[PDB]
Amino acid sequence: YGFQPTNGVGYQPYRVVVLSFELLHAPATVCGPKKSTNLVKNKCVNFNF
Amino acid sequence: AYTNSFTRGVYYPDKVFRSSVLHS
């Protein structure tokens, strides 16, 4: 590419980043923020592990 | 020399517990 500052859009350079989330078969890893919490027992609950 | 394995080289394909289950 011979990029030059007086190029019409669509010929100016764009920087690209491709994030690819993968899930092999480990025990866990990085994630959003969350908040975490304790844990009850026998109490029909809505859980996320 | 060459030799014959008999039933060798079986590994757990991954985590996840499991019991009596002829899993394929």
With beta carbons under 8 A apart, name residues in chain A contacting B12: none
Tokens coding B24: 């394929």
Check residue A6 and report its DSSP letter: T
- Terminus-to-terminus CA distance in chain B, angstroms? 34
CA distance A25 to chain B (A): 7
Tell whether B11 lies on the interface with A, counting CB pairs under 8 A. Answer: no
Residues of A near B (Cβ–Cβ under 8 Å) read: 25-27
CA distance B6 to chain A (A): 29
**Alpha-carbon gap, residue B12 to B10, rounded angstroms:** 7
Question: CB B17: neighbour CB atoms within 10 A?
Answer: 4
